[PDB]
Scaffold this active site. Structure first.
Site, PDB file in Angstrom:
ATOM      1  N   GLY A 123      31.179  38.466 117.971  1.00 42.07           N
ATOM      2  CA  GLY A 123      31.387  37.827 119.261  1.00 42.07           C
ATOM      3  C   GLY A 123      30.301  36.827 119.604  1.00 42.07           C
ATOM      4  N   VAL A 127      23.254  26.375 105.176  1.00 38.90           N
ATOM      5  CA  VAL A 127      22.004  26.710 105.854  1.00 38.90           C
ATOM      6  C   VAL A 127      21.844  28.225 105.941  1.00 38.90           C
ATOM      7  CG1 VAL A 127      20.702  26.523 108.028  1.00 38.90           C
ATOM      8  CG2 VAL A 127      22.003  24.571 107.163  1.00 38.90           C
ATOM      9  N   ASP A 136      33.012  33.249 111.184  1.00 41.26           N
ATOM     10  CA  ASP A 136      32.932  33.170 112.639  1.00 41.26           C
ATOM     11  C   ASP A 136      32.926  31.720 113.102  1.00 41.26           C
ATOM     12  OD1 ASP A 136      32.879  35.952 113.070  1.00 41.26           O
ATOM     13  OD2 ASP A 136      30.733  36.024 112.594  1.00 41.26           O
TER      14      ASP A 136
HETATM   15  N1  LIG Z   1      31.656  26.399  99.068  1.00 39.06           N
HETATM   16  C1  LIG Z   1      32.251  26.413 100.372  1.00 39.06           C
HETATM   17  N2  LIG Z   1      32.237  25.215 100.969  1.00 39.06           N
HETATM   18  C2  LIG Z   1      32.780  25.073 102.234  1.00 39.06           C
HETATM   19  N3  LIG Z   1      33.325  26.156 102.875  1.00 39.06           N
HETATM   20  C3  LIG Z   1      33.333  27.378 102.269  1.00 39.06           C
HETATM   21  C4  LIG Z   1      32.802  27.519 101.027  1.00 39.06           C
HETATM   22  N4  LIG Z   1      32.936  28.836 100.655  1.00 39.06           N
HETATM   23  C5  LIG Z   1      33.548  29.510 101.668  1.00 39.06           C
HETATM   24  N5  LIG Z   1      33.798  28.609 102.664  1.00 39.06           N
HETATM   25  C6  LIG Z   1      34.397  28.575 104.013  1.00 39.06           C
HETATM   26  O1  LIG Z   1      33.345  29.201 104.986  1.00 39.06           O
HETATM   27  C7  LIG Z   1      34.089  30.337 105.721  1.00 39.06           C
HETATM   28  C8  LIG Z   1      33.540  31.749 105.250  1.00 39.06           C
HETATM   29  O2  LIG Z   1      34.011  32.060 103.952  1.00 39.06           O
HETATM   30  P1  LIG Z   1      33.954  33.554 103.511  1.00 39.06           P
HETATM   31  O3  LIG Z   1      34.373  33.710 102.076  1.00 39.06           O
HETATM   32  O4  LIG Z   1      32.539  34.081 103.696  1.00 39.06           O
HETATM   33  O5  LIG Z   1      34.911  34.399 104.422  1.00 39.06           O
HETATM   34  P2  LIG Z   1      36.477  34.178 104.658  1.00 39.06           P
HETATM   35  O6  LIG Z   1      37.200  35.038 103.698  1.00 39.06           O
HETATM   36  O7  LIG Z   1      36.878  32.795 104.538  1.00 39.06           O
HETATM   37  O8  LIG Z   1      36.771  34.661 106.140  1.00 39.06           O
HETATM   38  P3  LIG Z   1      36.082  35.924 106.855  1.00 39.06           P
HETATM   39  O9  LIG Z   1      34.830  35.475 107.596  1.00 39.06           O
HETATM   40  O10 LIG Z   1      37.053  36.481 107.839  1.00 39.06           O
HETATM   41  O11 LIG Z   1      35.729  36.954 105.825  1.00 39.06           O
HETATM   42  C9  LIG Z   1      35.325  30.173 105.465  1.00 39.06           C
HETATM   43  O12 LIG Z   1      35.899  29.337 106.490  1.00 39.06           O
HETATM   44  C10 LIG Z   1      35.413  29.320 104.041  1.00 39.06           C
HETATM   45  O13 LIG Z   1      36.631  28.527 104.028  1.00 39.06           O
HETATM   46 NA    NA Z   2      24.987  30.235 107.147  1.00 33.02          NA
END
Ligand SMILES: Nc1ncnc2c1ncn2[C@@H]1O[C@H](COP(=O)(O)OP(=O)(O)OP(=O)(O)O)[C@@H](O)[C@H]1O
Ligand code: NA
Ligand SMILES: Nc1ncnc2c1ncn2[C@@H]1O[C@H](COP(=O)(O)OP(=O)(O)OP(=O)(O)O)[C@@H](O)[C@H]1O
Ligand SMILES: OC[C@H]1O[C@H](O)[C@H](O)[C@@H]1O
Ligand code: NA
Lengths: 312, 313
Positions: free
Chosen positions: A42, A292, A259
């Protein structure tokens, strides 16, 4: 003064310690280092919305303790600029927190304390709290506070005609049907989509099918997070649309990026942007986020997201 | 102002989580509850001194963070009344903290982050860092800040003629002889005394011989904490003084009680009381400490310690 993003949900102090190995019943060890950081889904989503320079309120519960001040500092006037009017602190519960034990081999061990997030809410939401969600442009929920509260918020926004998004991130319990029936957009990742539908989500066709089960359960819109594969927006009575990641130069830390994706999507939506432009706005934000280290300090300001989007 | 009690040492935020069992590698678990409290052996000892109404300074290093603020608030003008003039905060190290995982059986597992306590001290203490120790009536150290800093403080006092007490609590590393040679009173518990001497401490004869080893390492006075068996003060060339516990009506939480014992002893000693009276006073203060939860919240006021002394013998 635009109708605000209102986030109702969790706030956590994330207590990271770097240790060679775990301790033993009695063993006092020494971490290499440690840091305590503002987090919780949140608080993360609210921080993201405020940093995008959209008017954002966080409705949450803290303890009257140091971790509560930590959160308020990160989110408020001297931090992200979230409106904290509806955050309440209590003296009989600790601020929610997580002890994360990064180990010298790659394995994490975690102790989660729900604290105020799970135990400081009232039996019945106050009229004051419900008033900010009725006056919202859009509302964001997750699953790190009780179902009771999510349901009461969902009912109020539904009557007020205010869109609400439910992030499935949080506890891995089943979602009550009265919550599903009262939300506009469900937002699971691939693993969460599988757990609540009991169906496979390895392929896009399988995802579409689990989403079909979601429509039947009462959800007209599903925003599926796909990690490296990007995302997909499913709207009943329409064709699913997709957005791939906007590739990060380097992935430093994916903490908080889901998030960021969710909150950024909500901001673009409430700003009246097309579904395609919402997905792309969110992709751009998540992309800056993963470049970051950290959660809330990694979240991008509006100028940076817009800059990244400009690129062809 | 009387020559003050000066405590140079550690300040920790103590992060207590109640669990059933310790988690395993890769595993996420849930706790029943938790609490974050002001602590650290140095801050505890300073808080104790301040609550016993003796002018008390705490010399320590904090991060500029919420944990740092917790400490400052607990110790200062709205809390215990510790003089905080010589506390310094840095923005490149976190306030030290300790994750204390309480289990349902009774065992505690602890992860300690040194933070500013270990990393924010100058390589060489400046002489107006040392001005306060040079003005002290009595100085208290523990082993939760660097050996180098403890050595510099102790040497600065020895060359000024005021008593220095080293609480052995903290790191489980050997004590540098340079440090042992510069203090006046060593204060270990049974386990610390055994670790430091390499000798058993299961019997009073054994403890006395472990202490004789301490006398050989250059320490004239040893204040041994013996848990439920009380305490004893050994002075080289003299008969040992023994003090049993002043029994507590209920034991709620022993956290901070050793710190209370050592600081209360120091206050009694700097006020000119007899060794016997010092031990009794310390035992009474530790007795009260164990009857309230938390370290700094459990520190007793002077009147209560004196009342328990009046009525306990
Ligand atoms: N190399 C990348 N470059 C840009 N965006 C990325 C990259 N890898 C993951 N993401 C994006 O950053 C977000 C977090 O990805 P992450 O795999 O950690 O979780 P998620 O499966 O997409 O969603 P959740 O947070 O519900 O688990 C997502 O929106 C993803 O599309
Ligand atoms: Na980050
Ligand atoms: N039931 C009790 N009543 C009174 N004092 C007690 C009681 N139990 C322990 N103590 C005293 O509280 C202080 C700390 O006791 P504890 O058993 O926790 O460890 P310790 O070995 O004596 O000291 P340390 O904290 O340095 O290890 C001691 O001074 C002890 O004598
Ligand atoms: O003696 C108590 C102190 O030892 C450890 O340093 C804990 O922080 C605790 O407050
Ligand atoms: Na106590």
């Amino acid at each position: 003064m635009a109708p605000p993003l209102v986030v109702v949900g969790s706030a956590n102090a994330d207590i990271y310690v770097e240790i060679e190995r775990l301790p033993k019943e009695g063993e006092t060890i020494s971490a290499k280092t440690g840091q305590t950081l503002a987090g919780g889904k949140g608080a993360n989503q609210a921080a993201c919305g405020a940093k995008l320079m959209y008017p954002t309120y966080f409705v949450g519960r803290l303890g009257e303790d140091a971790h509560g001040k930590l959160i308020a500092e990160a989110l408020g006037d001297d931090g992200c600029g979230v409106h904290l009017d509806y955050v309440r602190s209590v003296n009989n519960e600790p601020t929610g927190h997580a002890v994360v034990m990064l180990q010298s081999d790659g394995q994490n061990s975690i102790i989660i304390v729900g604290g105020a997030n799970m135990k400081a809410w009232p039996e019945i939401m106050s009229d004051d709290d419900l008033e900010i969600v009725r006056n919202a442009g859009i509302v964001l929920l997750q699953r790190e506070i009780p179902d009771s509260i999510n349901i009461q918020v969902a009912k109020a926004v539904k009557k007020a005609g205010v869109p609400v998004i439910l992030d499935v991130g949080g506890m891995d319990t089943p979602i009550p049907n009265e919550l599903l029936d009262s939300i506009d957009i469900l937002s699971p990742n691939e693993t969460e989509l599988s757990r609540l539908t009991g169906m496979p989500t390895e392929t896009f066709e399988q995802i579409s099918q689990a989403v079909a089960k979601c429509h039947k359960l009462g959800v007209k819109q599903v925003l599926v997070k796909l990690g490296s594969k990007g995302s997909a927006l499913f709207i009943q009575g329409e064709k699913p649309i997709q957005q791939s990641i906007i590739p990060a130069a380097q992935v430093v830390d994916t903490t908080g990026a889901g998030d960021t994706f969710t909150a950024a999507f909500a901001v673009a939506m409430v700003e009246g942007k097309s579904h395609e432009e919402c997905l792309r706005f969110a992709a751009a934000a998540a992309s800056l986020c993963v470049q970051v280290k950290g959660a809330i300090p990694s979240m991008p300001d509006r100028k940076s997201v817009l800059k990244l989007l400009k690129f062809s």
